[PDB]
Amino acid sequence: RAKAKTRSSRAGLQFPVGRVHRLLRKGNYSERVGAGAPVYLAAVLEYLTAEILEAGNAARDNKKTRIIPRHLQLAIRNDEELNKLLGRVTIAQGGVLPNIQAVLLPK
Amino acid sequence: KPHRYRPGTVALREIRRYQKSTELLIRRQPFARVVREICLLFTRGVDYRWQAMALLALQEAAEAFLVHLLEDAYLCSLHARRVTLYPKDLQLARRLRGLQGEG
Amino acid sequence: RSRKESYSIYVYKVLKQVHPDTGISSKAMGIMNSFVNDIFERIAGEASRLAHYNKRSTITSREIQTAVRLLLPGELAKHAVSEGTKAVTKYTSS
Amino acid sequence: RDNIQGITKPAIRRLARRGGVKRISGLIYEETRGVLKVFLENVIRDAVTYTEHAKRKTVTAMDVVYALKRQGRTLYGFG
């Protein structure tokens, strides 16, 4: 018997690797999953979630230490290379961007 | 004196001659050149060969995208009660598709 | 008395590595849970048909690499693939 | 000699004529070339990503139908 350690801390990632390796074959996406694709997939999810949360720039203007989904919507609708990923996906208690046209405002 | 129609009355015979035709409307050599130009941009220099049925595939999909774009922009221009098309009309029908054209 | 697992703990752990002084409600946990169980499903459901095209019966890391270079729009992909590769090199150290 | 102006002016004229357009403006001949270019940039990237994954060096008609199907339009009739 030895001193065990997780796959995630052996890969230095925060997202779990046993979980993604359990889902990637027992969700019927192939009859075989390699030993590396869960590590890579945990990395991609890690980078995407950090890219969303770096949200916290929007939270400074509202001066609220929590993150509420209005902040998340004002992040994702207002950042293009994450807008197009979630372009036809909405968000609960969403709200839209503050948006008026140009012809509407009087002199 | 020569004989000229009223303008537009050529175009209607053009429409009724073209909607019946199932040919391709973009000539093969310029479209093949403009589709080989982008592979130099996207593959970091090295060119890729094109199986000549896939040229017919993109030659089909460019029409399947572009004639619907032009037809819908002309419909939106007909909403504005003006008979001709405009870049505003193409921009508007380019707009109201969400991300489904790019996603 | 039956368990339905989550990604709440991992989202909360990765919140510490970006904003060490912030909080998230329960509904923001719902957004950042359903986001992950959408985007992981989208990448795997792409990579499955991608490896099914070329008749390979596995899904290696390479098919996830093609999935993230194809699926993610633009320059974001250009970093994410990097964030994969360095990651998997850490899995070849130990 | 500019390789994007191969989609010439009467070709775009007849292409609108197929859609049922009576009269087209003088500035459509840039905007329709622009959207044709961005559509090809959103298709051929996926097609060469498919073939570059398969370590091939030509792009089969399957490897552009698969890029179209993921893009949002299937095209029937190519095997």
Binding site: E51, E54, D79, E80 | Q91 | P20, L76 | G34
Partner: peptide
């Protein structure tokens, strides 16, 4: 503060006319 990714968090970056 361990992540701080290098990118440009720019705009919606409108299509349909340019860029």
């Amino acid at each position: 503060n361990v992540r701080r990714t290098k990118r440009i968090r720019l705009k919606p970056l409108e299509y349909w006319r340019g860029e």
